[PDB]
Design an enzyme around this catalytic site. Structure first.
Site, PDB file in Angstrom:
ATOM      1  N   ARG A  57       1.117  -1.300  -0.648  1.00 27.97           N
ATOM      2  CA  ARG A  57       0.091  -0.024  -0.579  1.00 27.97           C
ATOM      3  C   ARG A  57       0.792   1.331  -0.071  1.00 27.97           C
ATOM      4  O   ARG A  57       0.099   2.266  -0.381  1.00 27.97           O
ATOM      5  CB  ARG A  57      -0.839   0.152   1.320  1.00 27.97           C
ATOM      6  CG  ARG A  57      -1.875   1.157   0.954  1.00 27.97           C
ATOM      7  CD  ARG A  57      -2.818   0.213   2.735  1.00 27.97           C
ATOM      8  NE  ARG A  57      -4.141   0.249   2.426  1.00 27.97           N
ATOM      9  CZ  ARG A  57      -4.893  -0.895   2.517  1.00 27.97           C
ATOM     10  NH1 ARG A  57      -3.980  -2.087   2.544  1.00 27.97           N
ATOM     11  NH2 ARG A  57      -6.809  -0.612   2.790  1.00 27.97           N
ATOM     12  N   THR A  58       1.736   1.574   1.082  1.00 28.69           N
ATOM     13  CA  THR A  58       2.633   2.577   0.830  1.00 28.69           C
ATOM     14  C   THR A  58       3.753   2.383   0.032  1.00 28.69           C
ATOM     15  O   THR A  58       4.621   3.219  -1.230  1.00 28.69           O
ATOM     16  CB  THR A  58       4.033   1.998   2.163  1.00 28.69           C
ATOM     17  OG1 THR A  58       2.602   2.359   3.676  1.00 28.69           O
ATOM     18  CG2 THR A  58       4.508   3.409   2.399  1.00 28.69           C
TER      19      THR A  58
ATOM     20  N   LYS B 173      22.932 -10.747   4.356  1.00 28.62           N
ATOM     21  CA  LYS B 173      23.516 -10.362   6.045  1.00 28.62           C
ATOM     22  C   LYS B 173      25.417 -11.540   4.509  1.00 28.62           C
ATOM     23  O   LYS B 173      25.139 -12.180   4.543  1.00 28.62           O
ATOM     24  CB  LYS B 173      22.959 -11.829   6.983  1.00 28.62           C
ATOM     25  CG  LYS B 173      23.592 -12.120   7.941  1.00 28.62           C
ATOM     26  CD  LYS B 173      23.236 -13.058   9.084  1.00 28.62           C
ATOM     27  CE  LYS B 173      23.590 -14.541   9.467  1.00 28.62           C
ATOM     28  NZ  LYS B 173      22.795 -15.006  10.280  1.00 28.62           N
TER      29      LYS B 173
ATOM     30  N   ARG C  77      11.949   1.632   2.954  1.00 28.07           N
ATOM     31  CA  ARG C  77      11.164   1.257   3.987  1.00 28.07           C
ATOM     32  C   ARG C  77      12.015  -0.420   5.095  1.00 28.07           C
ATOM     33  O   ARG C  77      12.061  -1.133   3.857  1.00 28.07           O
ATOM     34  CB  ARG C  77       9.656   1.050   4.391  1.00 28.07           C
ATOM     35  CG  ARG C  77       9.191   0.128   5.544  1.00 28.07           C
ATOM     36  CD  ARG C  77       7.231  -0.465   5.166  1.00 28.07           C
ATOM     37  NE  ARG C  77       6.707   0.663   4.935  1.00 28.07           N
ATOM     38  CZ  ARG C  77       5.540   0.521   6.271  1.00 28.07           C
ATOM     39  NH1 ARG C  77       5.388  -0.716   6.660  1.00 28.07           N
ATOM     40  NH2 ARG C  77       4.786   2.407   6.364  1.00 28.07           N
TER      41      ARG C  77
ATOM     42  N   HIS D 179       7.830   7.329  10.418  1.00 29.22           N
ATOM     43  CA  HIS D 179       6.589   7.084   9.384  1.00 29.22           C
ATOM     44  C   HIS D 179       6.235   8.456   9.344  1.00 29.22           C
ATOM     45  O   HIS D 179       5.041   8.677   9.029  1.00 29.22           O
ATOM     46  CB  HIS D 179       5.720   6.455   9.404  1.00 29.22           C
ATOM     47  CG  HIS D 179       5.016   5.246   8.081  1.00 29.22           C
ATOM     48  ND1 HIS D 179       5.224   6.266   6.404  1.00 29.22           N
ATOM     49  CD2 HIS D 179       4.267   4.392   8.095  1.00 29.22           C
ATOM     50  CE1 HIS D 179       5.305   5.344   6.031  1.00 29.22           C
ATOM     51  NE2 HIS D 179       3.656   4.387   7.250  1.00 29.22           N
TER      52      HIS D 179
END
Ligand SMILES: Nc1ccn([C@@H]2O[C@H](COP(=O)(O)OP(=O)(O)OP(=O)(O)O)[C@@H](O)[C@H]2O)c(=O)n1
Ligand SMILES: Nc1ccn([C@@H]2O[C@H](COP(=O)(O)OP(=O)(O)OP(=O)(O)O)[C@@H](O)[C@H]2O)c(=O)n1
Ligand SMILES: [Zn+2]
Ligand SMILES: [Zn+2]
Lengths: 153, 310, 310, 153, 310, 310
Positions: E54-55, E84, E105, E134
Site C-alpha cells: 500500500r505504501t 546478511k 522502509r 513514518h
C-alpha cells in the site's frame, strides 16, 4: 377490531396479510426477509387449519405495505401465498408472488471459491425458467446452480 | 508352518480365499485371548516415507500389543532418506540388516514390491503404495464385515462416493469377488465412477452389480454400505457442490435400513456422513478402525510365527 | 478403587486438596521404591499436536519407567492429522479405539476437555491446552515445594516475571490457595501484572498478597521464589530492555536468602536467572524438572490402577 | 373487549403463554430456543401495546408445557417474562424465569481460540451473578466473561 | 532554494512547524494544478526491505505522476540486498551512485538515519523504520486534517486504539503539538495506553489532553476521530475479546458527532470500523489514502527541485 | 465516446458481437500505425494477486507501448494486499484513488466483478478470476483467428484437450458463437468433456458441433486446431498415460491439414505439441502470443480514450 378467534384470526386495520404460506415457511420468511425489525404490530399464526392445504402459516403486519417486488421475493418459499393489502378493514388488494428476475441478499452461492463469501457485498442471483425448475446464476462467479442446490447451503 | 509364514503381504491379489480366511480367524482369536509377548524380542521397522498418522499409530499399537519393539520414521516432512541420491533398494538393503519385518508406506506405486527384491528374508508388509494397494485396510474392512454380518458371501454391499480414485473400494471389490453370491450396487457421480477393469473382472466371474443414483433406491436390500470421501479437488468447487455433493448420508436416510446394515468408511470422513448417523446402531466406522488392531496383529503374528499357539 | 481411578486430569480447578495430596504422596513413594512393570501391557498415546520437547520426553520417560508402551506423534511441523477436515472429536474417537490413556497437548484452549466427550473410558490427561491449563506442570511444582519445604501451607511464595500471560503462575496460585496461610508477593512489570481474576479469588478466600518492585524488598522472608520468563515480544525490544529487564536474578541477590529458600523456573530460562545462581544451594530449577518424572508417573499409576500396591 | 387488548384473540385451552417479552426479544426467543419446530398452533404478537408495561411481545404455544429448566433459560433474555401454563381455559400456573445454573447450547464463546468454534460441541457456560453483572465461564476454555460481552457475541 | 531542497526526510521531530506547512501548502497546489513532467529524467529507488504494498504503490504512483523513473524492490522472504554479510551501509553506498533519490522502509529502527551517512548527496526519505518513524503518513494525515477542518490549530482530536504501539499515533501527536491550542482525547485499553513520553512532552508545552474509556464519551466535542488498529498478537484472544462492549466504531455511535467530524484510519481496518460507517459523511479513511499521493508528490518535488513555482 | 470508453472489461458474456469487432478492428490499426504516446501521463496498476508472469509481461508491455506508467505487484507466496483481514474491497477502494485503470488477476471467481463495485469511475480489466473468465485471452485468440483466416464466421474450429476445465476453451466457444455459421469439433478424453452448458447454449443458437475421439478424424476439414493443456493433477498418472496412442500433435499428423489451418495454444505446451510442429506453416502459438500485445493495447486505448482516430 373484529371478532378474531385463532383457527383464522381477524382484522387488522390497514396493512399486509400474507396468507397461504406452506407449513413451516412462515418463520423462514420472518427471519429471511427481516419482517420483524419494525415497530408496527405484527400478529403471526403458525400451523393453522385452512382452505385446502389443511395446515398453513400466516403473518399480519399493520401499516406496512410491502409490495410488488417484495412480494415477488416470496416466490421460492411461498409461491402460492396471497398478499392481501388492507385499508380501513377492507381487502383493497390481493396479489400472489410471481417469479422475480433477481433475488438478492437471501441466498448463498454454493460455489466455495466464489468471492461473495468473504466480502461486504450481498448475494445476487439471476433467476430463470418457471415451475419445471429454476436455475440461479451467481452475479459474481457466474456459475449456474439448481435452485434446490442453493437452497440447502 | 502356517502358509503365511514369512510371506510379504504386498497385494490383495496375491492372497487367496484360504489366506483371507486364515487371517480372519486369527484376528478373531487374538481379539478374544491376547498374546502380548508373542513377538517378544522382535524389532519391527515402521517406515512411513509418506505420512499417514491413522495408519501408523494403528500398526505400531498392534506391534506393541504383541510384545514387539518398534523403530522407524514418518517423513513427507524431512527425515533424511534419499539424501544424496540413495536409492530405495539401498535403504531397504541397509534396514533389513537389523529389523525382523519392515512395515512401509511409500508415495510411488510398486515400492513395497521393490523392497521385497532387496529385503532378504525379512518380510515386507505393505501399508500403502501410492494409488496401488493397501491390503491391511482391506483385511480390516473384511474382518468388520465378517464380524457384524457373520459371513463374507451372499452379501449386498453398496459402494458410494468416489469410486474412481478410491484405492480401498477397488481392493475391497476384488477381495469380495473371491467369495460367492455377493451383489454390488455402485452409487457415484459420473465423473467418479468405478473403472471398467473392475467391472470387467466382476462380469467375467458372473457377479452381479448395478449402478444407482441415490442410496434411497437401494437402502432396503443393503447389508454393508461402504462410503468413501469425495476428495473436493477431484472435481472443481462448483462441481462438488453442484448437485454431485448428494452422496451424503444422514440419519433420516437410514429408516428403512435392515436391522443388520452397517455403515463403514475408511476415514477421514468430512462431509459425507452427517454427525447424527453416529448415534444410530448402524454407524460402525469407528469400530471398524479398532478392528484394524486385530487384523494388523493377526498378519504380524502369522508372518513372524512358524506355528501358532491357540 | 482410589479416587483418581480412571479420571481425566484436565484442570487444576477440578482437583481437590485431597486429590492433590494423594498424587503427592504417591510420587514420593515411586520416587523411593520403583514399580517398573506396574503399567506392563498398557499402551499409551502421546499426542503432542503442538510440539513441546521438554514436556514430551518427560511424560514418555515416565511411561517407560512404569513398563508401558508409547505410540504417538509431535506435530506443529506436519504429521498428517486434520488432513482433509478431520475434526478433533473424530481423531480422538479413532485413537481411543486402541490405546489405554491419551496424553495430549493442543494449541487451542479446551481441547483436552473436548477429547473427554469422545474418549469413552480411556482417560485423557492434559499436557497443555493453549493459554488454559497445564496440571502436570503444577503437580510437579507442588511436589518440589513440598519435598524441599516439607509443607504446602504457611508458605511465603514470591512470583516474579510475567504474571499476566504465564499460564503456570496462574495455576500454581490457584493450587496453593487450596491450602492455608500462604502469603503471596507478586513482582512484575506493570504491563505484565497478575490478573484481577486471580487477585479477586485470593481476596475472596482471605489470602494475603502484596505487589513489590524488586526482589530485594522481600528476599528475607521468602521460601519459594518462582521465576517466569518474560517473553520479549509481549513488550517491544526497547520496553523489555528499558528498565523492565530488572526482573533478573543473580547470585549476589541471594545473600540474605533464608537457608531454605529455593528458586524454581518451569524453563527455558534465558536471561532472567543468571548462570551463577546455578552453583548456589538455592538453585532448584533442574531438580524441579527431574521431579516431573515422579509427579507424572504418579498420575499415570493412580489413573490406570484401581488399587495401588505400596 | 374494550380497551381493545383481545377482540377475539387467542384464549387457549391447554398451553404455555409467554407474556411481557420486552419488545425485540420476542423473535430472538423463537429462533434461539427453537420454539417453531412444532406442529402445534403458535400465535405470536409483536410490538404489542402495553400501557400495562411500555410495549411487549407475547407467544402463545398450545398443548405444550415448556417448563422448569426450559423457563430458566429465558432469564438471560426476557428477565421478567411471566410464563403461564393453561390446561382448561385459564391460568393454572404463572412461573417467572429465575437465572439458571448453566446456560447450554445457545451462546458462543467470545474466545476465538476456544476449541468450541471448530468442533461438533454444544456450548455451555456456568452462570455467576457477580452483582453488577452475570459472569459466564466457558466449560471448554474456562475463560470467564461478562454476560454483556457474550451476548454481543 | 526552498527550505527542504536536498534534505533528508527521516523524522517528524526534525521538521519545524514551518516545514510542515510548506509541504502542505505545496500538496494543495499539486493537487489543484498537477505538473507531470517536473521530475522528468530523475530516477528514484523504491527500496522496500520490508513489504508494505500500500505504501509502496502510493509512493511509486507519486513518482510517476511527476514523471520520474522507478527502480527498486520489496522483500517478503526474498531478494539479495543487505544479504546478511552485505551491510545496509554498503547497499546504500552502492545504490546512491545509481539514483537521484532513495525512499526506503526497513524493519529496524534508524535504518534510514544510517543510510543518510552513506548516500552522498542523495536524499533519503523514510517510509518506515521499525517502530520509530513514518513522516509521510503524518504528512498526509495533517493534509487530510487541514483540508477537512480548515486549520491545524484549536482542534479537538480523539485518538483511539493501540496508542502504546501505533507509530502513526505517536508521530501525529508530536506534529499537531507544534500548532497551537489543540486538545487531545486518548481512548485506549489501559494495557495499550499513551506512553508517558508523549504525555510528558504535551505537559511541558501546556497542551490539554485527557484520557477516556470509550469514544461515546467524547463523540460530541470532537473534530478528528483517529482510529487505530488494535494489534491482536500482544493481546490474549480473551483479553482482546473482553473490552467493555468494545472500541469499534459503528454508525449508531456517530448519531451525535459534529457535522464536520471525520473518522481517519491509516488502514487496514479489519474490525474496529464497521462497513456502515463507510456510507456516513464522517468517513474519510479512503480519501485520506488518496491524499497520500499529494503529500508524497509535495515532498519529492521540494527535495529534488530548487524552488517550486506552481 | 467510443462504445467501450470507461467501461469495465470483466466477462466475454457482456461484450456484444459488435464490441468484439471494435476491439479487433482497433488492434489491427495499432499493429499497423503504432501510437506510443496515447496514454501519456496515465498510471495503470498491475495488481496480480496470482502470478502469471506471461500474462503480466504481455500487459505491462502493452501499457508501455502506449506510453503509460505502471505500478503494481504479483504474489506467489508474498506481499501484503488483500492480507487476510484486509478485504479485496478495501484494497481496491484504496488503489482506485491512486490510478487511472486496474488490470487484475485473482484466484477466486468474480473478484474482478467485486472490484467494479469499489473502483469509483476507475475501469477494471479482468486478467483472470479463478476458473471464470479471461476476456483478454479470448480477444487475442479471435484476433489471431481473424488475422489468419480472414473472417470470424463460417469456420471449422477443432477444440482439443481439457475441455471441461480449460477456461479459455469455454470463453472462445461463447465468443465464436456470436458470429454465424461456425461448426465446432470437440476432441477430448470423455472424463474432460465439454460441460453440458456450453453444448446446451450452442443448440439453442442452432450451431453445429460434434464430438470426436482423435484429431486424426477431423484434420481434413479443419481451419483452427485449438490445442489445450491436459491438466495432469485431476488425472491419475496411469489414466493420463492410457489415452489411445494419445491426443498430442506431431507434424506427421498434419500431413493432411488444409494449407490455411493453424494450430493455436494459449501456452504452456509441455507435452501435447511436439517440437517438430514448430517448423511447419500450421504453427501459430508464438504469433498468437505476440498478438496479445495488440489485443491488449486496443482494449486500454478504447477504455481510457474517448474516441480513437488511428
Ligand atoms: N381487515 C382485515 C380483513 C381481512 N383480514 C385478512 O384477510 C385475509 C384474506 O382476505 P379475504 O378476501 O377477506 O378472505 P378470503 O376470501 O378467504 O381471501 P383468500 O380466498 O385469497 O384467502 C384473511 O385471512 C383475513 O385474515 C384481516 O386480517 N384484516
Ligand atoms: N384460556 C386462556 C386464558 C388466558 N390466556 C392468557 O394467559 C395470560 C395470563 O395472564 P392473566 O393471569 O390471565 O392476567 P394478567 O394480569 O394479564 O397476567 P400479568 O400479571 O402477566 O399481567 C394472559 O395474557 C392471557 O392471554 C389465554 O391465552 N388463554
Ligand atoms: Zn458465486
Ligand atoms: Zn470458550
Amino acid at each position: 377490531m373484529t371478532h378474531d378467534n385463532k383457527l383464522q384470526v381477524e382484522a387488522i386495520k390497514r396493512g399486509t396479510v400474507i396468507d397461504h404460506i406452506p407449513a413451516q415457511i412462515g418463520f423462514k420468511l420472518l427471519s429471511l426477509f427481516k419482517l420483524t425489525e419494525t415497530d408496527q404490530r405484527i400478529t403471526i399464526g403458525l400451523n393453522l387449519p385452512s382452505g385446502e392445504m389443511g395446515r398453513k402459516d400466516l403473518i399480519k403486519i399493520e401499516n406496512t405495505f410491502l409490495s410488488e417486488d417484495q412480494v415477488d421475493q416470496l416466490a421460492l418459499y411461498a409461491p402460492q401465498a396471497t398478499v392481501n393489502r388492507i385499508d380501513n378493514y377492507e381487502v383493497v388488494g390481493k396479489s400472489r408472488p410471481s417469479l422475480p428476475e433477481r433475488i438478492d441478499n437471501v441466498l448463498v452461492c454454493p460455489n466455495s471459491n466464489c468471492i461473495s463469501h468473504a466480502e461486504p457485498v450481498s448475494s445476487s442471483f439471476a433467476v430463470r425458467k418457471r415451475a419445471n425448475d429454476i436455475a440461479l446464476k451467481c452475479k459474481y462467479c457466474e456459475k449456474e446452480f439448481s435452485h434446490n442446490v442453493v437452497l440447502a447451503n | 508352518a502356517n502358509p503365511l509364514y514369512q510371506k510379504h503381504i504386498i497385494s490383495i491379489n496375491d492372497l487367496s480365499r484360504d489366506d483371507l480366511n486364515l487371517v480372519l480367524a486369527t484376528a478373531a482369536k487374538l481379539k478374544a485371548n491376547p498374546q502380548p509377548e508373542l513377538l517378544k524380542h522382535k524389532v519391527i521397522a515402521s517406515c512411513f516415507f509418506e505420512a499417514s498418522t491413522r495408519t501408523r499409530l494403528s500398526f505400531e499399537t498392534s506391534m506393541h500389543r504383541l510384545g514387539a519393539s518398534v523403530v522407524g520414521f514418518s517423513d513427507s516432512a524431512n527425515t533424511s532418506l534419499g539424501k544424496k541420491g540413495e536409492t530405495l533398494a539401498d535403504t531397504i538393503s541397509v534396514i533389513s540388516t537389523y529389523v525382523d519385518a519392515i512395515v512401509m508406506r511409500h508415495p510411488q506405486e510398486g515400492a513395497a514390491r521393490l523392497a521385497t527384491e532387496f529385503s532378504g528374508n525379512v518380510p515386507v508388509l505393505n501399508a500403502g503404495d501410492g494409488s496401488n494397494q493397501h491390503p491391511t485396510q482391506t483385511l480390516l474392512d473384511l474382518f468388520t464385515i465378517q464380524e457384524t454380518q457373520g459371513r463374507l458371501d451372499n452379501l449386498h454391499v453398496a459402494m458410494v462416493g468416489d469410486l474412481k480414485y478410491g484405492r480401498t473400494v477397488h481392493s475391497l471389490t476384488q477381495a469380495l469377488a473371491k467369495f460367492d453370491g455377493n451383489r454390488f450396487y455402485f452409487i457415484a457421480p459420473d465423473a467418479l465412477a468405478m473403472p471398467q477393469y473392475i467391472l470387467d473382472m466382476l462380469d467375467e466371474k458372473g457377479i452381479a452389480w448395478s449402478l444407482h443414483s441415490s442410496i434411497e433406491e437401494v437402502m432396503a436390500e443393503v447389508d454393508i454400505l461402504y462410503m468413501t470421501r469425495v476428495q473436493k479437488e477431484r472435481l472443481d468447487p462448483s462441481e462438488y457442490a453442484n448437485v454431485k455433493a448428494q452422496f451424503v448420508l444422514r440419519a433420516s436416510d437410514l429408516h428403512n435400513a435392515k436391522a443388520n446394515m452397517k455403515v463403514l468408511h475408511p476415514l477421514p470422513r468430512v462431509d459425507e456422513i452427517a454427525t447424527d448417523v453416529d448415534k444410530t446402531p448402524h454407524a460402525w466406522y469407528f469400530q471398524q478402525a479398532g478392528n484394524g488392531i486385530f487384523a494388523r496383529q493377526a498378519l504380524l503374528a502369522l508372518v513372524l510365527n512358524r506355528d501358532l499357539v491357540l
